[PDB]
C-alpha cells in the first residue's frame, strides 16, 4: 500500500508476501480485491 488502500490492512511475511486483511468482515486474503484493483 503505497499510495491506494481503503479499509484493508496487509501485512508482510518475511518472505515477500503481503496479505490483505479487511475490517469489515475481518477477512485476510493474499489477493487484491476489487476495491483496492
Same mark, same amino acid.
Given at each position: $500500500? *503505497? @499510495? *491506494?488502500?481503503? /479499509?484493508? @490492512? /496487509?501485512?508482510? @511475511? *518475511?518472505? $515477500?508476501? @503481503? &496479505? &490483505? &486483511?479487511?475490517?469489515?468482515? +475481518?477477512?485476510?486474503?493474499? /489477493?487484491?480485491?476489487? /476495491? +483496492?484493483?
Amino acid at each position: $500500500g *503505497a @499510495t *491506494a488502500v481503503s /479499509e484493508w @490492512t /496487509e501485512y508482510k @511475511t *518475511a518472505d $515477500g508476501k @503481503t &496479505y &490483505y &486483511y479487511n475490517n469489515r468482515t +475481518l477477512e485476510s486474503d493474499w /489477493e487484491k480485491p476489487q /476495491e +483496492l484493483k
